Amino acid sequence: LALSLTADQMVSALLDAEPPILYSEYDPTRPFSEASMMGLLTNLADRELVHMINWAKRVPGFVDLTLHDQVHLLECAWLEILMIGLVWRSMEHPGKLLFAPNLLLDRNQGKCVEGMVEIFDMLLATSSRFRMMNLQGEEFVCLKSIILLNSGVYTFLSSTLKSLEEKDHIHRVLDKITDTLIHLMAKAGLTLQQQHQRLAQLLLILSHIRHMSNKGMEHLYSMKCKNVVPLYDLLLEMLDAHRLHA
Amino acid sequence: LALSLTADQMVSALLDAEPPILYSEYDPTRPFSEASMMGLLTNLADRELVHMINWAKRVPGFVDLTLHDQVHLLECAWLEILMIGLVWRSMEHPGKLLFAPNLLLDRNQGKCVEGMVEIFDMLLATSSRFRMMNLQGEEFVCLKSIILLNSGVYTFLSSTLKSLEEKDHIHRVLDKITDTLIHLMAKAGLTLQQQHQRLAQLLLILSHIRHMSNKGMEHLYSMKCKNVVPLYDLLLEMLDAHRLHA
Ligand SMILES: CC/C(=C(\c1ccc(O)cc1)c1ccc(OCCN(C)C)cc1)c1ccccc1
Ligand SMILES: CC/C(=C(\c1ccc(O)cc1)c1ccc(OCCN(C)C)cc1)c1ccccc1
């Protein structure tokens, strides 16, 4: 039961579920000018998605939900989740975005990546904010978890009895993550006021991540494929797994 | 000095700055089928904007900022501010959106308003959430203020000394509003844990309001005018006021 976990149990659970940092797929020995930035990012995102699924399934309370709800939450939050991870790893690289350990781009270079005319600078600003706030890994994982659960909680299908139970559960887990964040801050020696203030500062950044995701999706949709299986179905295929590999 | 205000002083200040509820402009005696929903909403929004300016100038700390920064914050947050007001007044009208006291539309009716294919339902969901949470007016005004100050704090021009001072001031005011929200909750008899949890629940709703604003702007831009003075300049004209009427 995810609702019985203690703060320390929540943090350890989340830290343990952290996905790996992937590398971009390209010939390091071959010219950089040849590669396509969007092709590289698209390929990176596609590989990260599989791992994101694995991660989501390990976020306490997520698997307690229905398959359809798990799919909806991920379809809503996937890009925000990729972006917050990106901002996090770019924290110690002022002026640059570490898309991957072998793919670090600066402002000027960004000016040439399609669909990033506005968001590159927004992402840098967010990374800078995390740096000023001295965001901790324990805090980062709670935030990423909040995004996954909060993403599409208010865009759910209907109001069936099961749907009401689902929403309630999500809000209870979210409440548990808030408690965890406060605990982490209390442990760090922050005063009560400093605790409330930091919690708020952190949650307000999530509105900026949503903004960046919306702007990114606007571009991705403006170059949408044709007869390509919908994200929903791909997520479903990956989420709707059997236990034959148990 | 807005930074010296007490919680009770902050709330009274915000409540006092509340803008009036405007009416839609149309012949109540004439057929409804004749009017254009987007024309009505556009005309309503335009009139609300002037009053929003007046309101912003009365949000503690806002006028301490530069004119250019005041304009940037409003250009980023204006639609979120209109939307949160809309959700707030539709709170006691399940299944309907009270665009104005003389303009209440239900789901089915929304299905016919351009640009609202997705956001109508999202707005209803938000109103429903506020209802379940039993959101208070004192809380609502703090939230609207947070939107105004948080909106474009991370999309500011450069990093000049003045810009760094500006950002710091905004974050200090935001911190003061957080304290105010916690105070309001403590006064309502909520426990410390219930306080942190509610603060988080309220701030997470702001990410959904940002989402709705982005979707709305997507449509508005898809029907953008030509030789029409940019929003920035209109906001500037309204904000850059003289004191000859003092
Ligand atoms: C911010 C970089 C980025 C992507 C990205 C972000 C973080 C990360 O870890 C990896 C990639 C990005 C780019 C493309 C993309 O494609 C997904 C859609 N495919 C399935 C067609 C996803 C993310 C992007 C998104 C929208 C527009 C421009 C760039
Ligand atoms: C949600 C209703 C709405 C508007 C609205 C919201 C709250 C409120 O109090 C009043 C209106 C809306 C519609 C049009 C609009 O136009 C502004 C641009 N003009 C200057 C060209 C602004 C808001 C809207 C926005 C985008 C798409 C579809 C509808």
From Swiss-Prot, chains A, B:
Region ranges (Self-association): 1-246
Interaction with AKAP13: annotated segments: 1-246
Q: Which residues carry this modification: Phosphotyrosine?
A: 232
Record PTM text: Phosphorylated by cyclin A/CDK2 and CK1. Phosphorylation probably enhances transcriptional activity. Self-association induces phosphorylation. Phosphorylated by LMTK3 in vitro. Glycosylated; contains N-acetylglucosamine, probably O-linked.
Outcome reported for the amino acid change (mutating residue 232 to A) = Reduces PELP1-mediated activation of transcriptional activity
Question: From which residue to which does the signal peptide run?
Answer: none
Give the subcellular location: Nucleus; Golgi apparatus; Cell membrane
Q: Where is the NR LBD domain?
A: 6-242
Specify the effect of residue 81 to C.
Loss of transmembrane localization, no effect on peripheral membrane localization. Impairs activation of estrogen-induced activation of NOS3 and production of nitric oxide. No effect on binding to ERES
Question: Could you tell me which residues are lipidated, with the kind given as S-palmitoyl cysteine?
Answer: 142
Q: In which tissues is it expressed?
A: Widely expressed. Not expressed in the pituitary gland.
Listed binding positions for 17beta-estradiol are 48, 89, 219
Q: Where are the annotated segments for Transactivation AF-2?
A: 6-246
- Please indicate which superkingdom the organism of origin belongs to: Eukaryota
Q: Look up the further comments and give them.
A: Selective estrogen receptor modulators (SERMs), such as tamoxifen, raloxifene, toremifene, lasofoxifene, clomifene, femarelle and ormeloxifene, have tissue selective agonistic and antagonistic effects on the estrogen receptor (ER). They interfere with the ER association with coactivators or corepressors, mainly involving the AF-2 domain.
Assembly and interactions?
Binds DNA as a homodimer. Can form a heterodimer with ESR2. Interacts with FOXC2, MAP1S, SLC30A9, UBE1C and NCOA3 coactivator. Interacts with PELP1, the interaction is enhanced by 17-beta-estradiol, the interaction increases ESR1 transcriptional activity. Interacts with EP300; the interaction is estrogen-dependent and enhanced by CITED1. Interacts with CITED1; the interaction is estrogen-dependent. Interacts with NCOA5 and NCOA6 coactivators. Interacts with NCOA7; the interaction is a ligand-inducible. Interacts with PHB2, and UBE1C. Interacts with AKAP13. Interacts with CUEDC2.
Q: What does this protein do?
A: Nuclear hormone receptor. The steroid hormones and their receptors are involved in the regulation of eukaryotic gene expression and affect cellular proliferation and differentiation in target tissues. Ligand-dependent nuclear transactivation involves either direct homodimer binding to a palindromic estrogen response element (ERE) sequence or association with other DNA-binding transcription factors, such as AP-1/c-Jun, c-Fos, ATF-2, Sp1 and Sp3, to mediate ERE-independent signaling.
The entry assigns this protein to a family as follows: Belongs to the nuclear hormone receptor family. NR3 subfamily.
Q: What is known of its domains?
A: Composed of three domains: a modulating N-terminal domain, a DNA-binding domain and a C-terminal ligand-binding domain. The modulating domain, also known as A/B or AF-1 domain has a ligand-independent transactivation function. The C-terminus contains a ligand-dependent transactivation domain, also known as E/F or AF-2 domain which overlaps with the ligand binding domain. AF-1 and AF-2 activate transcription independently and synergistically and act in a promoter- and cell-specific manner. AF-1 seems to provide the major transactivation function in differentiated cells.
Q: Which disease is it linked to?
A: Estrogen resistance: A disorder characterized by partial or complete resistance to estrogens, in the presence of elevated estrogen serum levels. Clinical features include absence of the pubertal growth spurt, delayed bone maturation, unfused epiphyses, reduced bone mineral density, osteoporosis, continued growth into adulthood and very tall adult stature. Glucose intolerance, hyperinsulinemia and lipid abnormalities may also be present.
The name under which this protein is listed is Estrogen receptor
**Protein's organism:** Homo sapiens
Q: Which residues of the full protein are shown?
A: 306 to 551 of 595
